[PDB]
Design an enzyme around this catalytic site. Structure first.
Site, PDB file in Angstrom:
ATOM      1  N   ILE A 174      40.446 -13.388  -2.001  1.00  0.00           N
ATOM      2  CA  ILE A 174      40.179 -14.774  -1.619  1.00  0.00           C
ATOM      3  C   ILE A 174      39.126 -15.385  -2.535  1.00  0.00           C
ATOM      4  O   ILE A 174      39.273 -16.517  -3.009  1.00  0.00           O
ATOM      5  CB  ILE A 174      39.751 -14.855  -0.142  1.00  0.00           C
ATOM      6  CG1 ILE A 174      40.910 -14.468   0.779  1.00  0.00           C
ATOM      7  CG2 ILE A 174      39.235 -16.246   0.198  1.00  0.00           C
ATOM      8  CD1 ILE A 174      40.593 -14.623   2.255  1.00  0.00           C
ATOM      9  N   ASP A 188      29.355 -11.077  -7.398  1.00  0.00           N
ATOM     10  CA  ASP A 188      29.901  -9.973  -6.619  1.00  0.00           C
ATOM     11  C   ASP A 188      28.836  -8.903  -6.435  1.00  0.00           C
ATOM     12  O   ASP A 188      27.750  -8.965  -7.013  1.00  0.00           O
ATOM     13  CB  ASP A 188      31.147  -9.361  -7.266  1.00  0.00           C
ATOM     14  CG  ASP A 188      31.989  -8.578  -6.269  1.00  0.00           C
ATOM     15  OD1 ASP A 188      31.536  -8.406  -5.118  1.00  0.00           O
ATOM     16  OD2 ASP A 188      33.082  -8.103  -6.633  1.00  0.00           O
ATOM     17  N   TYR A 244      32.031  -7.172  14.430  1.00  0.00           N
ATOM     18  CA  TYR A 244      32.745  -8.130  13.589  1.00  0.00           C
ATOM     19  C   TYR A 244      33.006  -9.436  14.325  1.00  0.00           C
ATOM     20  O   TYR A 244      32.768 -10.523  13.786  1.00  0.00           O
ATOM     21  CB  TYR A 244      34.059  -7.528  13.093  1.00  0.00           C
ATOM     22  CG  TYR A 244      34.619  -8.206  11.858  1.00  0.00           C
ATOM     23  CD1 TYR A 244      33.847  -8.377  10.717  1.00  0.00           C
ATOM     24  CD2 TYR A 244      35.926  -8.674  11.837  1.00  0.00           C
ATOM     25  CE1 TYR A 244      34.362  -9.002   9.594  1.00  0.00           C
ATOM     26  CE2 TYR A 244      36.450  -9.294  10.718  1.00  0.00           C
ATOM     27  CZ  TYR A 244      35.663  -9.454   9.601  1.00  0.00           C
ATOM     28  OH  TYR A 244      36.179 -10.072   8.485  1.00  0.00           O
ATOM     29  N   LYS A 296      31.390 -13.045  13.442  1.00  0.00           N
ATOM     30  CA  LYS A 296      32.270 -14.106  12.960  1.00  0.00           C
ATOM     31  C   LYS A 296      32.177 -15.350  13.837  1.00  0.00           C
ATOM     32  O   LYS A 296      32.167 -16.478  13.325  1.00  0.00           O
ATOM     33  CB  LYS A 296      33.706 -13.594  12.872  1.00  0.00           C
ATOM     34  CG  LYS A 296      33.976 -12.767  11.619  1.00  0.00           C
ATOM     35  CD  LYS A 296      33.286 -13.373  10.399  1.00  0.00           C
ATOM     36  CE  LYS A 296      33.548 -12.559   9.140  1.00  0.00           C
ATOM     37  NZ  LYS A 296      32.834 -13.115   7.954  1.00  0.00           N
TER      38      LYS A 296
END
Lengths: 239, 239, 241, 242
Positions: free
Chosen positions: B19, B38, B155, B159
């Site tokens: 992505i 990165d 998670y 999120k």
């Protein structure tokens, strides 16, 4: 009516004043043995002694929910005094309007207070609710986990995280017979500004901590036996 | 067509693969100068060199978004190479299914990686976007911020925290001319696939370029009055 | 760069002023052939003539979306001039603050205008989008399908019904190659201390132009939204008005 | 304790069997005088007299909520029998999966059955709840008003409209002292495909009509006196697929 808490052992955090004190008193009236805890030992001991005078079973402890020393202390004390754990009311928490540019030491604090402590507490209590046949977790959230406003970068994210943590760990500890639910309280009566805030509350009055206490008593009771992963907003119908 | 990114500087984290890499390429084709970052220096440098070969302006950097040294390094490198910051795509993140009894440290890591990193990045980038006359922040969340499932204790909470952080800090950095939006990607292309598509009504999986174009819309002047929104790019279902 | 509207035929309902006129114009600039419809024919004809003056392909029609005769006329209409239907913007609607004790015909009216109309239009347009190869449905909802406020017993219910109808018929017409999305517009621009009071709850410090909803719709009905469906995008500047 | 309904009069619609039957039997244990109504006089009369036999106050009438004839009939019958209206449980609904290309006479059905009916009912009941010093309206909705699925073109739209109608008319009738809430039930007990649907239900069992009955009793009791404009999903923690 399955709205009693007989043979129940309920650990109530931040329960020396306000919503926690009311939850502890009402749970005790329902027949549950209440481990009242607070950041202050004196307030928790006072509330627990008041409950015992009323005719209930209760103990009072000092717990900083962010301190695993204190968390294991509360779990072990509940087990020693009453033998089991069947209800966990994570009412302990705080935080408020912080600037966008806040020190990150405040952002991490909001989550260690409002989220990390209660998740670790639920981890600690879930096994004991398992040979006990099942239990009820209730995290007391806020209306900022749903609404969007200024200065809520830390509080709001933490409360929405509490909400979705409820909704998700409803799936993990369900097999253990444990129900995870949450309560989002509105304006609590612990003045033109007061009536200005009432102009968006359709019932025309502020809520008493007994409202949250009864919503919790419902959610922690056998009447809510097939209710899990639910956030219940007690707001009189508005924000 | 106000769907171009001329006179734009876009920082894109975790953008050596998938992505993030597709977002970097699409944003560079739109006329934006791209600071690809990165965790691994080599991948970011490779993607940036490919972008420069294709005819765009880009640099490649190593960044652990959890490292404030790396974060300030990326901010300063962007301001040096291109003089301003106008777009911040927090694609960097990770985690996944962890057990309910997980070591807490896992639970803190989920939030330090998936939330604390991007909030500190938005904090660092907001003054320069304000100075540059406004800009756009895009958090790459996940569909676990809305859905409820097993093993999603850390998670899912992180999120949903990203989702509500988007919604709320839309209010703080609004006066700065900054728009905050979020993308929730579905199943990504890179007979259980048949279950995936039993769910996905469009009968195919999504390409990284779909998320790339959604991001390009949300970070472009065509979305100039869009903020505080979570766009789900799932093809119309849940995978 | 899939934000271009080539070889598309869009049916924009209630496309005489505001959001509808902006949508028709911006779709036509994108290269789409626009069937502008409205409750009145003079406004639709004015907008269609103005688009043909800009250098687009457009026709103007009278359509009461609640009249199935009108619906079939519009489908046949665009269909006869252009040959296909590939985009359907359901912007035609209405209603507003009505009391709780409202006459029940008012309540049926809210749904017949804001819901039954666009659902029947989507029903009619799906075979031709299907037939074409793919298509786009965009229902222009309201921020009252999400928000809770007084006097919205009919309008809010209707708009929430629009939102969930979008989310669900995204599953039905998916296999047809059709995407169903919705737009929820905020306060639109058309010594105002009440205007600044409503801006206090809008973080971007300004009111939105019809061009904002126009570009959002253009994206959602574009090939750049090719794998987006069943979503309600709220264009509010980041707040509620 | 405030988990009672003494000095309460309850109009339950759709109560020959199932959620409405349990709601009528459970609200009556709380002391509420219940007006059990339904589509068939036989079932409403049967349930009503069973509430009487146990010791409660009840009657059973024919009500087709889409028929204003019966709509005013139940209002005036509850006042004839009991003098006041304080609680209105709208369980009478129904519908299901219909084709996308369905006629307007199926879509309009779904909405005249699941929504228009309970709205006109709330309109009729509100002035008496105002007269009686406040009350509780409780709409029974569905998990399809939140969740998305195929063929839900009419059921899902109608039940989401019910959810939002609750959330919004909470603001209208709040001044009257009235609280409007909604219950969304999951799979109701009334197999191995059952275990397949239970794999998505964390509490590993299906729900009994008493669960919805007790959630309803809580939501229309004095214990929920400051709860309005809320939809409570009674689902065991997840969605069940049949």
């Amino acid at each position: 009516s399955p709205f009693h808490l007989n043979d129940a052992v309920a650990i109530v955090t931040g329960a020396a004043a306000g919503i926690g004190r009311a939850i502890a008193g009402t749970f005790a009236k329902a027949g549950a043995s209440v481990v009242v805890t607070d950041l202050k030992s004196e307030g928790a001991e006072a509330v627990a002694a008041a409950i015992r005078q009323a005719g209930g079973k209760a103990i009072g402890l000092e717990c900083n929910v962010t301190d695993e020393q204190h968390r294991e202390a509360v779990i072990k004390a509940a087990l020693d005094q009453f033998g089991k754990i069947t209800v966990l009311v994570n009412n302990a928490g705080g935080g408020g309007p912080k600037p966008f540019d806040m020190p990150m030491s405040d952002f991490e604090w909001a989550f260690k207070l409002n989220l990390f402590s209660l998740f670790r507490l639920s981890q600690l209590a879930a096994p004991h609710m398992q040979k006990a046949g099942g239990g009820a977790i209730l995290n007391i959230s806020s209306m900022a986990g749903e609404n969007t406003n200024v200065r809520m970068a830390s509080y709001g994210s933490s409360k929405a995280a509490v909400n979705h943590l409820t909704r998700n760990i409803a799936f993990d500890v369900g097999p253990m017979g444990i129900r995870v639910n949450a309560i989002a309280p509105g304006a609590m009566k612990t003045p033109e500004i007061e009536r200005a805030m009432l102009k968006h509350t359709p019932l025309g009055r502020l809520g008493e901590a007994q409202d949250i206490a009864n919503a919790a008593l419902f959610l922690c009771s056998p009447a809510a036996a097939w209710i899990s992963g639910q956030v219940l907003t007690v707001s009189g119908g508005g924000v």
